[PDB]
């Protein structure tokens, strides 16, 4: 994934664009992988990063949402492909005109496949009460997200923040899982980063964190941050957080074996016993 961050493959920030619908038996993510473009984070994101590494890719399907009396062309300068762009899977909704309002809306998506989906939506934490009155509008803001096993009723939290890459706002991306023939109804009066294409898991994979280069001539199975472990040895001193079909981490740095005899230079006492000595006379056996 290189400069893509593995949670961006369901959002599509401008470096994950070659990656939106991948399919892999080995996902690789890098230290420079920034999951976002607009600065922010995913809430409960280590549960989400542990779904995706063993998922075998993601097979996006449309959610069929249409939107009315509303603009959906929201972009920002921090997300660049050739111009001011946005995410590939999400929709920065806004107002129609800048200071009238945001009309109240409600949508719903019924899972109709066999597999469980992964929804991911977003709440936008603006910098002030002067920008949510110009992005979305006056009044309070509310984003209820409900299914058969779930409701949370999120809300933004504006305020002044430290800049990371020029902007002082955030976006938190939350996520649930729908089961077959369920629904999620989203009602929201603003401050919402709607999805446009939900995701369905394809198969199986593993996931590794690393910082070295890809080598398709080598054939290996146990992968850590500085590379790949390959032997039949049960114990490894190399890295404790080695994932895959990895050997077991240990503290000490050498453990041994033999083939045969304790050595004599020239539990019954046979090696140097009453036959007290050795040879170099015969040279095939012992």
């Amino acid at each position, epitope marked *: 994934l290189g400069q893509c961050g593995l949670l961006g493959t369901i959002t599509g920030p401008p470096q994950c*664009d*070659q990656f*939106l*619908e991948f399919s892999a038996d080995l996902i690789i993510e890098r230290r420079e992988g920034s999951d976002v473009c607009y600065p922010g984070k995913f809430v409960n994101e280590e549960a989400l990063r542990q779904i995706l590494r063993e998922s075998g890719g993601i097979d*996006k399907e*449309s959610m069929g949402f249409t939107y009315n009396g509303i603009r*959906t*062309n929201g972009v920002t*300068s921090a997300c*660049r*492909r*050739s*111009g*001011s*762009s946005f995410y*590939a899977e999400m929709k920065w909704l806004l107002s129609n005109t800048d200071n009238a309002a945001f009309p109240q809306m409600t949508k719903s998506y019924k899972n109709t496949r066999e597999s469980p989906a992964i929804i991911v939506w977003g709440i936008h934490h603006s910098v002030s009460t002067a920008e949510q009155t110009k992005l979305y509008g006056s009044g309070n803001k509310l984003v209820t997200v409900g299914s058969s096993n779930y409701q949370q009723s999120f809300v933004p939290s504006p305020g002044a923040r430290p800049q990371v890459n020029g902007l002082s706002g955030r976006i938190d991306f939350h996520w649930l899982i729908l089961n077959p023939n369920d629904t999620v109804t989203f009602s929201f009066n603003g401050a919402f980063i709607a999805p*446009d294409r939900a995701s369905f898991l394809r198969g199986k994979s593993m996931g590794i964190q690393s910082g070295v280069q890809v080598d398709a001539n080598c054939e290996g199975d146990c992968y850590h941050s500085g590379g790949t472990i390959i032997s039949n040895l049960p114990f490894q001193n190399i890295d404790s957080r080695a994932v895959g079909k990895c050997p077991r981490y240990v503290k000490q740095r050498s453990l041994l074996l033999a083939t045969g005899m304790k050595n004599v230079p020239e539990l019954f006492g046979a090696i140097a016993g009453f036959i007290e000595n050795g040879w170099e006379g015969l040279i095939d056996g012992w």
Partner: antibody
Amino acid sequence: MVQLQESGPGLVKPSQSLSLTCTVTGYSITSDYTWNWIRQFPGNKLEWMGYITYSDTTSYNPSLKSRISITRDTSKNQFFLQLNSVTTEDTATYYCARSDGWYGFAYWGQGTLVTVSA
Amino acid sequence: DIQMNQSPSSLSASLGDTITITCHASQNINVWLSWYQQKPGNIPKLLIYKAFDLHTGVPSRFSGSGSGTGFTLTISSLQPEDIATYYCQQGQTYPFTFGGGTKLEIK
């Protein structure tokens, strides 16, 4: 409403220099989008050839990089291609555009049919 | 170079029919296709960007679809001004490519 206009004389002999010059009224080139030029064949086959950005960088078609120079000017609000080593095959219509790129090719122009002949 | 083989080159239909046509790109261009309406004698103009979104200004009965390798627009309720050559744009890599086009007539 954005509207952009080309200018240029309509004759060129092979291996000469004929320039293409696009002027944009009302909107600047420093705000961040790229500016492509697009080629139009007899038989309405099309190819792209290059662009200049808001940020002074160039990138061209990998069959044509030895032929193209794109530069741009601010007091005229203009972007500038001069195409050398021409051939009679290159009879085409050249569309200048505020090209959004990954959002497609947003604005277009009327386009000027220029002729290459002996 | 990523080739766009827009099939077929010619198709005619009646007013109110449904037509399904394929822009088939050679490699994976995940959501980056941008399709263009050429009137014969008038300039191309944008109708669909990012394979899904209507450029605001066009009437609503356009609906582009498909994803992946093969792509598809549909027109239900064909109208007499819909005589065009519908060009499609690859937008994953450099260089850009266009395609051969198609011809749509009133039968």
